[PDB]
């Protein structure tokens, strides 16, 4: 097995990001077993990405658990090789050995440039990763087997580097979040252990690179009604009164000459009498406040039935004893109380002001840091208001609260105005074998965290894509909202609190289901006791549960009645037996895994029809694809990721290598296949080419620039890199280029792809026009013909599988025993698969 541990330090850059690029940390290996179970103990060190790096124990990609450096999102090093894309590439170092005890690894990642460097025991790793995707956040990660001991050296407070950081590289410990504490946590998980037992957990939540940006609303150009002199002056005066009162309560005083150490107010007059700059600043502040109010849905109103008179302006305690004092108060708070709308308006105005301030900061050049570094232009507070801690939130709110109080007292009648979908829902169900069809049964579920929880009974057939209660296959109950779901929502009972247990009592004998909370029966509007009733048994039901993102809960099937709670409260005297009572071993369940995989097209698909015709006239065997509901009601359009079920494998060594010419027919190693794009289908939304086996992109906003790419650049001792191997997972061209090369044309678009299994190049042609786009691959690689298309017509494409002059068809590459057969013949095994987001695990 392999276990990956991260140092809970996430660094990523973006356009306008506030995080610094260069980061350097260290790791020291202390103890290791040479051969765990006679097999050399695995231990890799490297960096990983937030989105795309989800290792799983057992049944990973390739032959085993991916861990570090087995995907296009994580990059690792194991002392002799660099791991990426499930490919180990040997790298030269002054010290070439597997990580032994008492071995110090140095790791440095500069976000600014796509480069990662490693250094084993002071011997730098000559090779580096380059030109990878920097989107998201990067974090250190170490994978290992049993029998090892390693210690982090993130620097500063946590750990200490055994070698000086490279020039410009800051210690990684400076990127710790202020709200959380540094720790060692897994990447993603679907379960947890606790005192009650196995607590299922939902998908973990993370931030994005675009979340940290400030996006304010400019209000300086807003024009205001003639309130500037009428009542804005009043507002200014009242703000000056409050400010002077606060300074009198503090140690500030009013001396005729301005001094900061002597605590002297520059004006030193009861009335502000501030000169033009000061007066304009203290006026324009309330002016911009009114501008924000009018820019929002708020409308100011100066009419207050001569409230200025009624306002008790005799709030003077004589405490002032300098030139500037006598700052009266109007008892405005007492006169009018802030409504919740006014309070949320204060929050929104403070957020907008801090937002413009943050934008000005980042524009000037400020970049977020754990601490404040004025010379290096770093500020912990420069993050957006929504991203601030509570201290700055309370610091930047009191003045706006007082201003809004003044507004109330002056009677302004202002009134305030897909891919993650399955990555935010985790479903757990029992194994279909456990389904029963007779007898009253019972199970319990404790909602450790209240929210996004649906618990109930579901038939063995459970569509992992659809939620619970949408299809009639489940009598689930969403207690978080207090509504039972079978085909829609239906209010029933009351929502639970934290730590509340829900008892689900199925009655196969009476065909009824009862949902109870903490031993108390939940009631209906009409008073029906059982939550469900009149239930056709059919295949049966299972204790199904659905948890939202990060949601935690304990599913107790009832193996032991001693640990089973509230069974004597409800179920024991009602004739209910706990689920799986006599089983010696715990029940095996099936959860919803969110790994995208290609699956064959269903013949009953609502919108995609797949024809297949072979031996046609002047056309080789071809498989056609056409939309079903186009130009009709109930029609939808969505991205379609398609692939073929059989690949073409390159040779082990890349040793070069009308009427058709026989010797070129017998000596050729290139193969052909064409795509016919039908009229009515916009060519700007079609893609033809190939994908590698390790392709897991289900982007509904797929673009040609969204393709994965990473370069393995191996060097020498002096740094003269000798390698530039470019790796990707898709090689499909866009149709828009060919349609621009040249309304609806009756001639279909013919795109012929050529592949050379011996030289190692993949080429494209379209409508008889050569395509500058070419690709070069490595030996011993298998490529599946794939197509990416947005359906926008009744008939979209047709995949012909044929041959050209002096060019064999793909069947000779497809079949070893049929390598010398020039006749094209689509294999019976061959089929078209489309990408599905969720599977069962």
């Amino acid at each position, epitope marked *: 097995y392999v276990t990956s541990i991260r140092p809970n330090i996430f660094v990523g850059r973006a356009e306008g990001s506030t995080q610094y690029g260069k980061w350097y940390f260290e790791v020291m290996v202390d103890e290791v077993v040479p051969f765990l179970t006679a097999q050399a103990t695995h231990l890799r060190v490297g960096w990983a990405l937030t989105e795309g790096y989800s290792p799983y124990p057992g049944g990973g990609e390739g032959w085993g658990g991916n861990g570090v450096g087995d995907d296009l999102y994580s990059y690792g090093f194991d002392g002799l090789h660099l791991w990426t894309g499930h490919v180990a590439r040997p790298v030269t170092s002054p010290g070439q050995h597997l990580l032994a005890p008492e071995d110090v690894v140095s790791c440095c990642l500069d976000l600014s440039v796509p480069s990662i460097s490693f250094r084993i025991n002071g011997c730098p790793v000559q090779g580096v990763f380059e030109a990878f995707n920097l989107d998201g956040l990067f974090f250190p990660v170490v994978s290992f087997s049993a029998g090892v001991k390693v210690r982090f050296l993130l620097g500063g407070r946590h750990g200490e580097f055994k070698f000086l950081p490279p020039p410009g590289y800051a210690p990684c410990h400076e990127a710790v979040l202020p709200r959380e504490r540094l720790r060692l946590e897994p990447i993603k998980e679907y379960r947890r252990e606790g005192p009650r037992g196995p607590h299922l957990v939902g998908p973990s939540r993370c931030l994005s690179h675009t979340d940290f940006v400030p996006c304010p609303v400019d209000t300086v150009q807003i024009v205001l009604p003639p309130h500037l002199e009428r009542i804005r002056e009043k507002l200014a005066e009242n703000i000056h009164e409050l400010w002077a009162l606060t300074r009198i309560e503090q140690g500030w005083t009013y001396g005729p000459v301005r001094d900061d150490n002597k605590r002297l107010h520059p004006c030193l007059v009861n009335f502000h009498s501030l000169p033009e*700059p000061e007066r304009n600043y203290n006026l324009q502040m309330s002016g911009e406040t009114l501008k924000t109010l009018l820019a929002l849905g708020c409308h100011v109103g100066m009419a207050d039935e001569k409230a200025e008179d009624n306002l008790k302006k005799t709030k003077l305690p004589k405490t002032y004893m300098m030139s500037n004092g006598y700052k009266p108060a109007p008892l405005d708070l007492s006169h009018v109380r802030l409504t919740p709308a006014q309070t949320t308006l204060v929050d929104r105005l403070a957020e907008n002001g801090h937002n413009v*301030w943050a934008r000005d900061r980042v524009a000037q050049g400020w970049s977020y840091s754990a601490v404040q570094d004025i010379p290096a232009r770093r500020n912990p507070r420069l993050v957006p208001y929504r991203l601030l801690d509570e201290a700055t939130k309370r610091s930047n709110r009191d003045s706006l609260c007082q201003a809004v109080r003044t507004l109330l007292g002056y009677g302004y009648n202002i009134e305030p105005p897909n891919q993650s979908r399955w990555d935010r829902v985790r479903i757990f169900r029992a194994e279909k074998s456990y389904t029963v069809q007779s007898g009253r049964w019972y199970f319990e579920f404790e909602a450790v965290t209240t929210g996004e929880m649906r618990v109930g009974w579901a038939r063995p057939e459970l569509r992992p894509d659809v939620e619970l209660g949408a299809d009639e296959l489940a009598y689930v109950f969403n207690g978080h909202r207090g509504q039972r779901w079978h085909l829609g929502s239906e209010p029933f009972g009351r929502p639970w609190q934290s730590g509340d247990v829900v008892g689900c009592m199925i009655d196969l004998t009476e065909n009824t289901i009862i949902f109870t909370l903490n031993g108390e029966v939940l009631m209906s509007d009409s008073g029906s006791e059982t939550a469900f009733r009149e239930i056709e048994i059919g295949d049966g039901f299972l204790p199904v549960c659905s948890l939202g993102p990060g949601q935690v809960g304990h599913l107790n099937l009832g193996q032991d009645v001693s640990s089973l709670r509230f069974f004597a409260i409800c179920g024991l005297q009602e004739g209910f037996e706990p689920f799986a009572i006599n089983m010696q071993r715990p029940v095996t369940t099936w959860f919803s895994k969110s790994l995208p995989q290609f699956e064959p097209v269903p013949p009953e698909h609502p919108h995609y029809e797949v024809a297949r015709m072979d031996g046609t006239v002047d056309t080789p065997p071809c498989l056609r694809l056409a939309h079903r509901t186009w130009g009709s009601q109930n029609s939808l359009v969505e991205m379609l990721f398609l692939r073929l079920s059989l690949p073409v494998q390159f040779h082990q060594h890349f040793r070069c290598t009308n009427r058709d010419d026989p010797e070129i027919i017998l000596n050729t190693t290139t193969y052909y296949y064409s795509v016919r794009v039908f009229a009515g289908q916009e060519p700007s939304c079609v893609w033809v080419g190939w994908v590698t086996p390790d392709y897991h992109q289900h982007d509904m906003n797929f673009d040609l620039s969204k393709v994965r790419a990473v370069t393995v650049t191996m060097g020498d001792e002096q740094g003269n890199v000798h390698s530039s191997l470019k790796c990707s997972n898709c090689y499909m061209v866009w149709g828009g280029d060919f349609v621009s090369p040249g309304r609806i044309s009756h001639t279909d678009l013919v795109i012929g792809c050529l592949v050379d299994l011996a030289t190692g190049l993949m080429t494209f042609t379209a409508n008889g026009k050569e395509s500058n786009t070419f690709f070069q691959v490595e030996p011993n690689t298998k490529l599946f013909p794939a197509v990416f298309v947005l359906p926008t017509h009744q008939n979209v494409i047709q995949f012909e599988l044929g041959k050209q002059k002096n060019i064999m068809p793909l069947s000779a590459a497809m079949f070893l025993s049929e390598r010398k057969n020039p006749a094209p013949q689509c294999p019976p095994r061959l089929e078209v698969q489309m990408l599905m987001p969720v599977s069962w695990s």
Partner: nanobody, 126 residues
């Protein structure tokens, strides 16, 4: 964003006049305050005499000698002249411009953070 190009203070002996012309090129907005700071090599950075809008002058301990600052917000031009010299005056001067009004900020840390640093100039005394 204000760029404060400061040039002046060439090496000289004790009693030699050193002029320092600084230019705070940028928006003519929020030009009400102008400060100066000397970071002595490996030593604390002390506040030199600052002048706020309205020909207002604020002095400190580091103004000892003959500091004659003639900065004007009209054209963002600083003219810190130092006729006298002492051997402890060897410091990297800096030209910081800010929006703070009369050295007081009723609003708080937001506007306070509104500072624009400048390259500054090594001043050396033999």
């Amino acid at each position: 964003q204000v760029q404060l190009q400061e040039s002046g203070g060439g090496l000289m002996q004790a009693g030699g006049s050193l002029r320092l012309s600084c230019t705070a090129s940028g928006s003519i907005f929020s030009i009400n305050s102008m400060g100066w700071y000397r970071q002595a090599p490996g030593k604390q950075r002390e506040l030199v005499a600052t002048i706020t809008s309205g020909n207002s002058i604020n002095y400190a301990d580091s103004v000892k000698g003959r500091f004659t600052i003639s900065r004007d917000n009209a054209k963002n031009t600083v003219y810190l002249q130092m006729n006298s010299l002492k051997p402890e005056d060897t410091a990297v001067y800096y030209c910081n411009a800010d929006r703070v009004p009369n050295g007081y900020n009723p609003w708080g840390t937001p506007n306070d953070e509104y500072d624009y640093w400048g390259q500054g100039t090594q001043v050396t005394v033999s």
